[PDB]
């Protein structure tokens, strides 16, 4: 059994469950867990438990295959319905993007922890999208479709707790991400916002204390321009000064 981080990393990445995960994520979690000074066996188990939570319930290999099939048939809505977070968004999708884009439709969007949401941006006619996430299966769904459509979408397999997004754009989307980052590393959510090379951002939280947390913690160089509940998301439009 794995008795060090390197061997544990190899083991986890070889598993059917975790093979599509960003290797940096696996190493980050293993290294943090190793620092708790438990046995190698307990440490690897603790790491797997965390990775299970990080992978979550958003997609499966079969749902990803079905999303690809949907895209091949031109059924973008069906593909969107096959990631749990976009499925939640479906009913009010155009209301949401109408709200975000009311003043201006951006040329280039950075979609941070993108899930399958870039497919919605395609349908909104966004010219250029860069999305990052830690599950390569997401890129494996979106990228072949983007190439078929001559659409300027790029996917990065990137853990934002390992390295900040380096790209630049007109608008960053940070949907349903800040809470999970904060739970995992205190202070990381606002640090992510401070790192983004966009003049404006749209940040969302699940909703029917996130509002209080966000409004109380948003660094002074940002201004909240609007705030609205649309479907089961609370959305803030912010500008960086
Ligand atoms: N450290 C990390 N770096 C990058 N992405 C991460 C991450 N931890 C979790 N994620 C990703 O965060 C996403 C949360 S679900 C939200 C997906 C998308 N933003 C949407 O709203 O539709 C998942 O796709 C998950 O894989």
């Amino acid at each position: 059994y794995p008795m060090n981080i390197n061997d544990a990393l190899t083991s986890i990445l070889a598993s059917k469950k975790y093979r599509a995960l960003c290797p940096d994520t696996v190493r980050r979690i293993l290294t943090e867990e190793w620092g708790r000074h438990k046995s190698p066996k307990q440490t690897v188990e603790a790491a797997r438990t965390r990775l299970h939570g990080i992978c979550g319930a958003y997609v499966t290999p079969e749902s990803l295959k079905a999303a690809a099939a949907a895209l091949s048939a031109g059924d973008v809505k069906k593909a969107l319905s096959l990631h749990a977070s976009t499925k939640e968004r479906l009913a009010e999708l155009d209301t949401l993007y109408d709200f975000i884009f009311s003043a201006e439709t951006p040329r280039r969007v950075l979609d941070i922890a993108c899930g399958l949401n870039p497919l919605a941006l395609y349908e909104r006619g966004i010219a250029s999208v860069w999305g990052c996430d830690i599950h390569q299966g997401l890129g494996d769904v979106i990228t072949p479709f983007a190439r078929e459509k001559d659409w300027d979408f790029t996917f990065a397999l990137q853990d934002v707790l390992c390295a900040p997004p380096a790209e630049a754009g007109d608008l960053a989307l940070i949907f349903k991400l800040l809470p999970l980052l904060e739970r995992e590393q205190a202070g990381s959510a606002m640090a992510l916002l401070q790192s983004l090379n966009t003049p404006r951002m749209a940040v969302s939280f699940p909703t029917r204390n996130y509002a209080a947390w966000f409004e109380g913690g948003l660094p002074a160089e940002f201004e909240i321009e609007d705030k609205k509940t649309i479907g089961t998301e609370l959305i803030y439009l912010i500008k960086k000064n």
Side-chain angles (χ1 to χ4, degrees), residues 86-107:
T86 42
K87 187 176 185 159
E88 290 167 354
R89 188 168 299 121
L90 266 177
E92 310 273 318
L93 187 67
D94 282 319
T95 303
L96 173 69
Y97 285 112
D98 288 354
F99 173 76
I100 298 174
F101 300 156
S102 75
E104 185 180 46
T105 303
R107 191 195 82 78

Side-chain angles (χ1 to χ4, degrees), residues 1-3 29-30 33-34 36-50:
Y1 305 93
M3 305 294 292
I29 293 306
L30 281 165
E33 290 308 314
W34 226 270
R36 301 193 206 285
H37 304 146
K38 311 299 185 159
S39 73
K41 180 182 178 192
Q42 180 176 329
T43 302
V44 173
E45 285 195 31
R48 288 184 88 103
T49 296
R50 283 182 64 190

Side-chain angles (χ1 to χ4, degrees), residues 206-207 209-219:
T207 202
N209 296 311
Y210 294 136
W213 172 80
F214 186 73
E215 295 172 26
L218 186 65

Side-chain angles (χ1 to χ4, degrees), residues 8 10 19 21 26 30 36 42 48 64 150 182 219 240:
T10 299
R19 61 182 173 200
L21 264 186
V26 181
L30 281 165
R36 301 193 206 285
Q42 180 176 329
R48 288 184 88 103
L64 290 166
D150 293 328
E182 193 65 18
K240 183 170 201 185

Side-chain angles (χ1 to χ4, degrees), residues 25 28 54 58 83 85-86 89 111-117 132-135 138 158-161 175-177 180-181 184 204 233:
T25 302
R28 174 175 60 84
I54 291 165
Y58 313 109
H83 186 286
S85 172
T86 42
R89 188 168 299 121
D111 194 353
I112 311 304
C114 62
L116 294 185
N117 181 73
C132 65
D133 208 297
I134 53 170
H135 190 326
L138 302 167
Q158 181 175 341
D159 185 323
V160 301
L161 298 175
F175 293 171
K176 298 171 181 178
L177 178 64
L180 75 84
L181 293 179
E184 200 163 350
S204 82
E233 273 176 293

